[PDB]
């Protein structure tokens, strides 16, 4: 439930091939950017960093949980369906 890993913007790159090492079966890669992750305070900062480095980018809007109406008393409604059958 914690939300502390949803505060900052991140930049990541496309995933490329990983293959099995013939000797040990380990996951080999030839992609030098496979583990590169950058943290930014705002979308604008991340976009500016991508442009000056020449990377084409896809920005995705921040998804914020919608505010909800919570009511403990609705659990015992006289005539509504929100009445719970157990606690």
């Amino acid at each position: 439930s914690g939300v502390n890993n949803t505060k900052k913007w991140k930049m990541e790159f496309d995933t490329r091939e990983r293959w099995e090492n013939p000797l040990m079966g380990w996951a080999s890669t030839a992609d030098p950017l496979s583990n590169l992750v950058l943290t930014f305070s705002t979308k604008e900062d991340a976009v500016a960093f991508a442009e000056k480095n020449g990377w084409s980018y896809d920005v995705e809007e921040r998804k914020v949980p919608k505010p909800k109406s919570k009511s403990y008393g609705a659990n015992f409604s006289w005539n509504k369906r929100t009445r719970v059958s157990t606690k």
Binding site: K80, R81, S85
Partner: protein, 44 residues
Amino acid sequence: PFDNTTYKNLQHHDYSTYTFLDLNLDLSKFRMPQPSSGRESPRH
């Protein structure tokens, strides 16, 4: 006369398994109609 030396709650010595529910069934004709929530249950 006035007697304060005997126990006058001896009727329950003759009560049985269905005494309470039989009394509840007898009381039914005196009740007022029950209010309604508008549906058969919270799941309707």
